[PDB]
Amino acid sequence: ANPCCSNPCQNRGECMSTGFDQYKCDCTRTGFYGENCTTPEFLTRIKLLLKPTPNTVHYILTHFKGVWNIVNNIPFLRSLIMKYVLTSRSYLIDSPPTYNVHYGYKSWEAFSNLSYYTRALPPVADDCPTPMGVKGNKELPDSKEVLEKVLLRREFIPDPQGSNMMFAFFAQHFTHQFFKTDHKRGPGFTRGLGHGVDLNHIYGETLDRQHKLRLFKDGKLKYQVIGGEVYPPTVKDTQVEMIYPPHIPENLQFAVGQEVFGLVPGLMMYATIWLREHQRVCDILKQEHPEWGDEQLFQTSKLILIGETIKIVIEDYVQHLSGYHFKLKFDPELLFNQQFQYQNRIASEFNTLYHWHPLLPDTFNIEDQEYSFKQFLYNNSILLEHGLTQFVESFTRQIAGRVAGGRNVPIAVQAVAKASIDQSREMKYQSLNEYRKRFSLKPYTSFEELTGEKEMAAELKALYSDIDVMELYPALLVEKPRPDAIFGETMVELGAPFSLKGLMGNPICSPQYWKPSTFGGEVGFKIINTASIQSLICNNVKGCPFTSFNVQ
Amino acid sequence: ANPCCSNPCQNRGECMSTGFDQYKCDCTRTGFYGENCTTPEFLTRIKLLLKPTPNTVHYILTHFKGVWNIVNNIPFLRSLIMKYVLTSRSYLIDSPPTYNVHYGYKSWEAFSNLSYYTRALPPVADDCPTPMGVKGNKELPDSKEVLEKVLLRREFIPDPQGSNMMFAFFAQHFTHQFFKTDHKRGPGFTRGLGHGVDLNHIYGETLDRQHKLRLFKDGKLKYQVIGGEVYPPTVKDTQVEMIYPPHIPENLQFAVGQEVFGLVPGLMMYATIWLREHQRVCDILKQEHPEWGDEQLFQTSKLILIGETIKIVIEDYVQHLSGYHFKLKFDPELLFNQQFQYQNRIASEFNTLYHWHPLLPDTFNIEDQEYSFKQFLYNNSILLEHGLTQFVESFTRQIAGRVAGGRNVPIAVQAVAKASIDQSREMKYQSLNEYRKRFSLKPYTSFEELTGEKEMAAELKALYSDIDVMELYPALLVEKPRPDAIFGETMVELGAPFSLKGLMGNPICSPQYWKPSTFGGEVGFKIINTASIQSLICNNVKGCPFTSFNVQ
Numbered sequence A, B: 001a002n003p004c005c006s007n008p009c010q011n012r013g014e015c016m017s018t019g020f021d022q023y024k025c026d027c028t029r030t031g032f033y034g035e036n037c038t039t040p041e042f043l044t045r046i047k048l049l050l051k052p053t054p055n056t057v058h059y060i061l062t063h064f065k066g067v068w069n070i071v072n073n074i075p076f077l078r079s080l081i082m083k084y085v086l087t088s089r090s091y092l093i094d095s096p097p098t099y100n101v102h103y104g105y106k107s108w109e110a111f112s113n114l115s116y117y118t119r120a121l122p123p124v125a126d127d128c129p130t131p132m133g134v135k136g137n138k139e140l141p142d143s144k145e146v147l148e149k150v151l152l153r154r155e156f157i158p159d160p161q162g163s164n165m166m167f168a169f170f171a172q173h174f175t176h177q178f179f180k181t182d183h184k185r186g187p188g189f190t191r192g193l194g195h196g197v198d199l200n201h202i203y204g205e206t207l208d209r210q211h212k213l214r215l216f217k218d219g220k221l222k223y224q225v226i227g228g229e230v231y232p233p234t235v236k237d238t239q240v241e242m243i244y245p246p247h248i249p250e251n252l253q254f255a256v257g258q259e260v261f262g263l264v265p266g267l268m269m270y271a272t273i274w275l276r277e278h279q280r281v282c283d284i285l286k287q288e289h290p291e292w293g294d295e296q297l298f299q300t301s302k303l304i305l306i307g308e309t310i311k312i313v314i315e316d317y318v319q320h321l322s323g324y325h326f327k328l329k330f331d332p333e334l335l336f337n338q339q340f341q342y343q344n345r346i347a348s349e350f351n352t353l354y355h356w357h358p359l360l361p362d363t364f365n366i367e368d369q370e371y372s373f374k375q376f377l378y379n380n381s382i383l384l385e386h387g388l389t390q391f392v393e394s395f396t397r398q399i400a401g402r403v404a405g406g407r408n409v410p411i412a413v414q415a416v417a418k419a420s421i422d423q424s425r426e427m428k429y430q431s432l433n434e435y436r437k438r439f440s441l442k443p444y445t446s447f448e449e450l451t452g453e454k455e456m457a458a459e460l461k462a463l464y465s466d467i468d469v470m471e472l473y474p475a476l477l478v479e480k481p482r483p484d485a486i487f488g489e490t491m492v493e494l495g496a497p498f499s500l501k502g503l504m505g506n507p508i509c510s511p512q513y514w515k516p517s518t519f520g521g522e523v524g525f526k527i528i529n530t531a532s533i534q535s536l537i538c539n540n541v542k543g544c545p546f547t548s549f550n551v552q
């Protein structure tokens, strides 16, 4: 019934029901006019007839290596380039936020209720003929049918980019501070009220929690020593509530900070390296401040790790994921003369996009022993067995699956992949094409166009019939990867904005915050500006097991 | 012991204890260098040798009327001027926030714990020799002694600017949505987690609360009709918890939204006009949207009233408070090309500055009857007695006391004034001079300089001895008012920043939010863009009792 059901408003304008069967588009600031914010302003024509497509640019970024290496050495240029990646990308997200699970309109509730994941595209009116608004049949293809026909893995397809397990697990750990669906309330509700890189997953979600995990001596988090090794303290000791299967013998029920990092040793590995990292900084800050006390050592340490995290995620993680010859840079200054909202709200779409289960191999091979999912799950003795160094070496050397491409979802976490399909549906999502449109991308004219082949393509067609009506999540996985890459234009184009805004839209990046003293001195500031996944490991694992997010 | 106790860091740099007896100043971006961020950069000299003092500008603003009127009619110019007031003012506050009651340093806690009032200047180290850091005696003058010697009122001094009661109570109502000290935790802790103009004082602090105050029919708030008049529903009906003296006969225990607006009829008056206003919009929005339902009529209505509020507060309230011949303007676009943080955190200092008890007369004269504080307090029958129209007429014509100047605090709310003194002290505040410095103002060289006379001046001197050591709150009230004005340079200079940032740093002002459709159409948008205290009353009081924030 909703006259807007048909998503009639183009080029970003807003749709509004001006009467029962009437609608109106608010093309304000869109750069277009007319009934559907379709006809461009003359200066808009100009821009259109000048914008290199994603692939064009993606080409030029991943090519011309020699040229690039020159650029990477002309600071000014690199700075100007990175500066431009931050602004354009970021300019794609709404800050302050608008819309959510329940709000198809702006509303003060939608805006302030921090218990929701924000939504880049409003949901679909509960009174719309078809799930995707108006197009398509009275229901979308059975989830199980899509799960099996185009998602599930047969032959393990490895990542053509080299992503090893250090990366797969870093991305599991890292994003899990912001994606924490509150299943008590339903999908669309988050338990991470910080909405960003606050390291809640190391220090705890709340004050009461963090104080249970602290030592209160030199700003250090509590820990224990097994072997001559440092490990997270137990739930029995700190008394923090963690999620662990009852059969776990205690003494292995680690505390850490995120109540779920005990269900997967890849997480507890990183849970332990950062715990190690925190302390390491404490001692450093104490060496500089004999006069500082616990809480200041702590609060400052928690600020340095946030910087490392952001540092590492931009120049190692994201760098690698891009495969660009251009050296990405974490420099909060790039935006000091730019208009930029140092705030952020994690969106549902980002959560979906970040469902990278295909990275998972069929066995977790930790030097000499290979493990079934079932054997690895919440089995911390494995961590205690080989112990970090031999865990880091194993994982540095072990490709992860290709995300995009097709049929790569481990049958193990298949309950998950289906769940994703199901939930996106319950959270009234819009078509992959609308989302494509939302991110200045050109829509797919065919399943055949989407996949880059016809086996699955036609296979999906049989299911979704009309390409438009194709769903966002599935499409991401069953999509033509750009060359020897792990993702396709959609996945990069939709996530990069969400990813840089949440990375750069953090208080420590604000001018008031971005200064030596904010971190304990030029010494602490450097700990941030010279962070790396190699150092992260080098300084916290037994020998300096060389690592990277690339399986060589 | 804290080597920073002496507030050694000038021109905004940060102080840091680099060793027990040593400190270091982080002059980053201050525009100065050297041990204390004292020596300016050459380009800083320039700026210094070109900045008209507050009074200079204040003069030129309040003078040259003829010139000004020309300006006010050259949009472009006015827009450019207003644009300049927003940016410069706003540029004075830290966003994101830094420091609070407990945090003398940046910390993630200080930043994220929304239960605190942020702090423009860090507190004083609990291990500092003297309350004001190092200067002064082991203690500040007994509060009771300052209260009485220079604060308390003898002869009611009226406001030389004309502030009547509509203004005094509008300011009581208005700021009371953001200042809501959580006395359960202590001064420095707020109960207004929205930190701004969210109209929490009309709709309720929480969802559970707002839903109790709602009618759930056409987006309207619940109400009742006494006489042929609309009034807030009762606590017995809605079941919302309000603070009322037990002797109140129920039936007069109004609900409204802020749990304290029943203790003062001036508040309940405005509590009722906005309730009236909300509904009024609902009907308007239903007239445009036959298809809309409750929650949308509501959520949109609550968005229009926030706009009106911001509108009225800039062009009527603030306008008047300034006495500038230049017409202040509410135009969210002024900042669309500017760098601006559409966020905010209410600071303690703003709460203090906003302690305008001196506006209160000695009796509340509501046409034909005059009331003692004791008689007026939580006496709603008075409202039901004369009823709005004759309440608006009375209040439009009844001056309020002068804030600045000296000795104007009603002996009634004297417990309050002392309380302020006492609390600012417990919240480890800094000297009035430090604050003066903080806002680019030149410090007072003498109590004599402060007051603009010597009776009190010397009187204060006997108490504080060293001018620096003089406290912020007292000084605000016992300060030479600029000409025929209600405040003096300190009060304007410290609050205008806090005030414009919280007004302009609101989501509805952000580009995504500032558009016709955000409010239900070009009709709803106008309800905002043509708001006024006169219309607020005109459209919601029996006859259009003419009003203004000026007693003619």
Ligand code: HEM
Binding pocket: A168, A169, A171, A172, A175, A179, A180, A181, A264, A266, A351, A354, A355, A356, A357, A359, A360, A413, A416, A419, A420
């Ligand atoms: C041992 C490895 C892993 C296991 C067993 C695993 C398992 C799961 C499971 C059971 C869910 C819950 C789905 C539901 O109930 O609806 C989930 C969610 C998720 N997983 Fe994984 N996962 C693993 C690795 C990863 C990796 C490497 C990534 C990379 C980004 C990832 C990203 C996600 C995301 C973003 C969610 C949603 C989080 C939320 O909204 O709560 N997972 N995973």
Ligand code: HEM
Binding pocket: B168, B169, B171, B172, B175, B179, B180, B181, B264, B351, B354, B355, B356, B357, B359, B360, B413, B416, B419, B420
């Ligand atoms: C009938 C008139 C008024 C009465 C009886 C009154 C009474 C009070 C009282 C009892 C307090 C609490 C102090 C404490 O316990 O520490 C207070 C706080 C305050 N009042 Fe008023 N007041 C009135 C009018 C005003 C006006 C017109 C203003 C104008 C701005 C004002 C501004 C404030 C502020 C900003 C606070 C602090 C609020 C907070 O932090 O919770 N008051 N007032």
Ligand SMILES: COc1ccc2c(c1)c(CC(=O)O)c(C)n2C(=O)c1ccc(Cl)cc1
Binding pocket: A085, A318, A321, A322, A323, A353, A354, A485, A487, A491, A492, A493, A494, A495, A496, A497, A499, A500
């Ligand atoms: C292959 O090329 C890539 C891949 C990923 C990228 C980027 C470029 C860029 C930068 C750029 O594209 O210019 C950013 C910011 N990426 C992300 O961090 C990211 C993270 C998660 C998701 Cl789901 C999507 C994107």
Ligand SMILES: COc1ccc2c(c1)c(CC(=O)O)c(C)n2C(=O)c1ccc(Cl)cc1
Binding pocket: B085, B318, B321, B322, B323, B353, B354, B485, B491, B492, B493, B494, B495, B496, B497, B499, B500
């Ligand atoms: C006499 O001249 C004034 C007085 C008050 C003013 C302003 C100008 C301006 C604008 C300007 O000065 O340009 C703003 C924004 N004012 C406030 O609303 C305000 C409110 C409360 C406090 Cl505590 C302090 C200031």
Ligand SMILES: *[C@@H]1O[C@H](CO)[C@@H](O)[C@H](O)[C@H]1NC(C)=O
Binding pocket: A006, A008, A034, A035, A036, A037, A038
């Ligand atoms: C807008 O779209 C509708 C159908 O979606 C169509 O009838 C109408 O002509 C279009 N108008 C413009 C200006 O695009």
Ligand SMILES: *[C@@H]1O[C@H](CO)[C@@H](O)[C@H](O)[C@H]1NC(C)=O
Binding pocket: A113, A114, A115, A116, B207
């Ligand atoms: C957020 O919204 C949902 C539904 O409106 C509500 O149940 C929940 O309590 C709200 N959360 C907060 C913190 O207000």
Ligand SMILES: *[C@@H]1O[C@H](CO)[C@@H](O)[C@H](O)[C@H]1NC(C)=O
Binding pocket: A206, A207, B113, B114, B115
């Ligand atoms: C904020 O701080 C106070 C005192 O430190 C604490 O009691 C309260 O729980 C904190 N709130 C949050 C949300 O952490």
Ligand SMILES: *[C@@H]1O[C@H](CO)[C@@H](O)[C@H](O)[C@H]1NC(C)=O
Binding pocket: A369, A375, A379, A381, A382, A385
């Ligand atoms: C956990 O892994 C260890 C080492 O590979 C193994 O001995 C143990 O059987 C596993 N635990 C379970 C419950 O299978």
Ligand SMILES: *[C@@H]1O[C@H](CO)[C@@H](O)[C@H](O)[C@H]1NC(C)=O
Binding pocket: B006, B008, B034, B035, B036, B037, B038, B039
């Ligand atoms: C800074 O202040 C200290 C004492 O507070 C003094 O010794 C030093 O000379 C000052 N320097 C400047 C440039 O103000």
Ligand SMILES: *[C@@H]1O[C@H](CO)[C@@H](O)[C@H](O)[C@H]1NC(C)=O
Binding pocket: B374, B375, B379, B381, B382, B385
């Ligand atoms: C409150 O006002 C009413 C009506 O004017 C009056 O009857 C009553 O005496 C007042 N209450 C007190 C305690 O004075």
